[PDB]
Design a protein around this ligand. Structure first.
Ligand SMILES: Cn1cc(C(N)=O)c(C(F)F)n1
Length: 435
């Protein structure tokens, strides 16, 4: 695996020990061979788990999720996917790693797709080796891969709203269930229904995942309601998955706005990862997977792949060369390489709108490319009428940095800024000049 110009897809089935058994073997070998190595975790939670698997090996943890005193001498770095791409974007020197290891390498967030693109391009250039660890590489068509123990698969109608009758099987179960919903809002409704029926429910989503995931260890629970973020290496001591088989797809319409389309079917890779939360313990056969729809290749035209191009157009590789997306996932977007390359000052604005601004990549790009500076929030208020953001069926309002109450009506409307209460709260703070 370790030879220059090699990219290896380590596609052992879910729970086959890629992270806890194989990875430390790869790391030991890398250190013996004096290969400057990076290890890329999808989440802080995974980073912390990796620390436990690698304990006693000389690894620099470039994350506050791990409390360790480094020697200074480590030639192996560990950071999150997002942190890697973030450092590439910024005017900070990122070592040209000889070996690049991506765990949970199916992650479809823009920064992860961009990271794969950059790393695979380095490998194709002859510069580096890489190892992508995932049970579900890009374009997999198998939603039902092998497991540590047999799984009972059943196609069944799964509720997506509060119910009073007709789904007794949901609540009659005495074990622990992980339930994949397509959005925070939808999970909130199902969670409230389960709570009303006497169940203990934890909810997980991107923004809450570190904090809330700990509750799954510290408290007793009957249900975990989660979005697709729990596809990325989240482990639960569960005996059932309920899978709506549904997700939201950000879609750019007319180059002009972003909508959250669907809910619509998940990919085969996502379904397999959802399912792969269970069947993990060879001493507990008969874990259940209840699934409420089919799969489809809904990554096609999904905005994350275009956003990944926006990231990659703005990462230095060599002169004017631009990294390509990783070949198996490169046709998911119709983009011209370099179309999104920004001049130095607009690039810095772009970066800052993502990093400090916490805006979606697409939105950050619209603002930066328009020649707007990071602190200039006039664009949050001067959109067309149909860009009015609504909060409880009334237009959302903030007090501007000038102290004037105005309706939130962004010049570029990206649905992700108001997909749930928390998101809209954050966008309100942004529009007000509060970060
Ligand atoms: C990516 N790449 C750039 C060069 C070069 N230095 O101009 C070469 C090699 F064939 F010399 N590969």
């Amino acid at each position: 695996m370790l030879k220059k110009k090699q990219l290896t897809v380590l596609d052992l089935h879910p729970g086959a020990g890629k992270t806890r058994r194989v990875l430390p073997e790869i790391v030991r070998e890398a250190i013996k061979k004096r290969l400057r190595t990076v290890i890329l975790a999808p989440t802080r939670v995974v980073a912390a788990e990796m620390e436990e698997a690698l304990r006693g090996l000389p690894v620099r943890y470039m994350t506050t999720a791990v409390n360790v005193t480094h020697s200074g001498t480590e030639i192996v770095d560990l950071m999150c996917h997002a942190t890697f791409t973030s450092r590439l974007l910024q005017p900070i020197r990122v070592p040209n790693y000889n070996l690049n290891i991506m765990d949970e390498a199916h992650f479809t967030d823009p920064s992860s797709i961009a990271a794969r693109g950059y790393i695979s391009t380095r490998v194709e250039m002859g510069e580096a080796a890489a190892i992508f660890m995932t049970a579900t590489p890009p374009g997999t068509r198998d939603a039902f891969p092998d497991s540590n123990s047999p799984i009972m698969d059943t196609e069944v109608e799964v509720p997506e709203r509060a119910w009073s009758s007709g789904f007794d099987w949901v609540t009659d179960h005495s074990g622990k269930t992980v339930w994949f919903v397509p959005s925070v809002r939808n999970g909130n409704e199902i969670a409230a229904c389960l709570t009303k029926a006497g169940k203990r429910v934890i909810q997980l989503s991107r923004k809450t995942f570190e904090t809330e995931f700990q509750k799954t260890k510290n408290q007793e629970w009957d249900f975990v309601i989660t979005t697709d973020i729990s596809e990325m290496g989240a482990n639960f001591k569960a005996d059932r998955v309920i899978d709506s088989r549904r997700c939201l797809k950000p879609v750019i319409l007319d180059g002009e706005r972003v909508i959250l389309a669907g809910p619509m079917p998940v990919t085969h890779a996502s379904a397999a990862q959802r399912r792969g939360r269970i069947g993990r313990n060879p001493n507990k056969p008969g874990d259940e997977y209840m699934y409420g729809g089919g799969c489809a290749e809904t990554d096609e035209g999904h905005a994350h792949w275009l956003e990944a191009r926006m990231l990659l157009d703005n990462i230095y590789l060599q002169d004017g060369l631009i990294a390509s997306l990783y070949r198996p996932e490169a046709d998911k977007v119709a983009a011209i390489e370099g179309e999104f390359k920004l001049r130095t000052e607009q690039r810095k604005t772009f970066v800052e709108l993502m990093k400090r601004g916490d805006l979606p990549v697409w939105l950050a790009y619209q603002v930066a490319s328009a020649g707007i500076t990071y602190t200039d929030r006039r664009w949050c208020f001067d959109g067309t009428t149909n860009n009015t953001i609504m909060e409880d069926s009334v237009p959302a309002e903030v007090w501007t940095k000038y102290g004037e109450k105005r309706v939130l009506k962004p010049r570029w409307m990206d649905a992700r800024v108001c997909s749930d209460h928390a998101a809209l709260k954050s966008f309100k703070e942004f529009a007000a000049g509060k970060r």
